[PDB]
């Protein structure tokens, strides 16, 4: 089980030849928080879906790791911007378990806000405005046509903005053909810069890997499969593969041509996660006794929205995951 890449493949398979874009950490963090109030088989599926084994120590480490990450981000980044946060919007009628609220505040630094879900329009405005603010206007209207039977919405957001360590020169950007397929061509602004880059020719998966650094410790990795090998590369993606690429990188001089682009992803994860074995939490048989003792509580949907902008100066990326609970 490989969470990030099994999820990637599920999304890719659900929408062939389409752009794909999401934040693995936003979703994993959301699932980890969800597990705090899950029980029995419902919790089991979530932990196994995240790639954990049956050891209690692994569960403790899961939360400890995320708590450490959130605390680390409370310190100013060096050279760029990276924000990650959580919030619970709960209706006054809802009675959350003391332990769940405490765990959310302590482990996930979650914000807690009262919400009148009977006022669907008002609830959407409150939550969407919050998400937009936290993502500096990049994630707008996360929630659309809200159920109205909603009682709690758990939100995770992530915002990233960084300048390339070395920018592309605007005078080096020219219109070029982009081959979606050998027969489908689209015109795109193609940026370019000759420089030394971390590079690797992966003969196993058949792709070229290039690392492009951001100011700070973050980096972008661009993967170009050989002709006709995108499916092969997608099938081979894994945590191990990524580790291999990052450690085997070698410095090489390249005249790099990369398109200036902006793409996004909008998903109803409740329809996708069952592919990773996470299904009970979305049913009437969900065991969410840890979040509320109220009967018939389940997750109606888990919406994810992610966007990215890549240009000559750098990259801006953001995402949010809204987990909606109903009675």
């Amino acid at each position: 089980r490989d969470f990030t890449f099994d999820l990637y493949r599920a999304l890719a398979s659900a929408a062939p030849s389409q752009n794909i874009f999401f934040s693995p950490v936003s979703i994993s963090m959301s699932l980890a928080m969800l597990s705090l109030g899950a029980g029995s088989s419902t919790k089991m599926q979530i932990l196994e879906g995240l790639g954990l084994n049956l050891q209690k120590s692994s569960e403790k480490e899961l939360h400890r790791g995320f708590q450490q990450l959130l605390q680390e981000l409370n310190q100013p980044r060096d050279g760029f911007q990276l924000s990650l946060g959580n919030a619970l919007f709960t209706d006054l009628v809802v009675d959350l378990q003391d332990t769940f609220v405490s765990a959310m505040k302590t482990l996930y630094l979650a914000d807690t806000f009262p919400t009148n879900f009977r006022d669907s329009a008002g609830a959407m405005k409150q939550i969407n405005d919050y998400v937009a603010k936290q993502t500096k206007g990049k994630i707008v209207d996360l929630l659309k046509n809200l159920d109205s039977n909603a009682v709690v919405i758990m939100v995770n957001y992530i915002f990233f903005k960084a300048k390339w360590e070395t920018s592309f020169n605007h005078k080096g950007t020219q219109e070029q053909d982009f081959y979606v397929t050998s027969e489908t061509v689209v015109r795109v602004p193609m940026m370019s810069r000759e420089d030394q880059y971390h590079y690797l020719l992966d003969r196993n998966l058949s792709c070229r890997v290039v690392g492009v650094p951001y100011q700070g410790n973050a980096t972008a990795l661009f993967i170009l499969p050989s002709e006709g090998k995108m499916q092969q590369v997608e099938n081979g993606l894994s945590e191990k593969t990524l580790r291999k690429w990052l450690k085997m990188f070698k410095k090489r001089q390249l005249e790099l041509y990369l398109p200036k682009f902006s793409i996004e992803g909008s998903y109803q994860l409740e329809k996708v996660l069952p592919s990773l074995g996470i299904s009970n939490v979305f049913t009437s048989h969900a065991d969410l006794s840890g979040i509320s003792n109220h009967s018939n509580i389940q997750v109606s949907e888990m919406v994810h929205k992610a966007v990215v902008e890549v240009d000559e100066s750098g990259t801006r990326a953001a995402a949010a995951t809204g987990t909606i609970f109903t009675f």
Binding site: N19, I20, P24, L82, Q176, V308
Partner: peptide, 28 residues
């Protein structure tokens, strides 16, 4: 210098001791 052009579908990772974002640019 070796000329490398991303003019076919490609993948993008944004990493920092964690996979912050992951995607496929199929149709820019």
């Amino acid at each position: 210098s070796q000329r490398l052009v991303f003019n076919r579908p490609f993948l993008m990772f944004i990493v920092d001791n964690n996979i912050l974002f992951l995607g496929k640019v199929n149709r820019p």
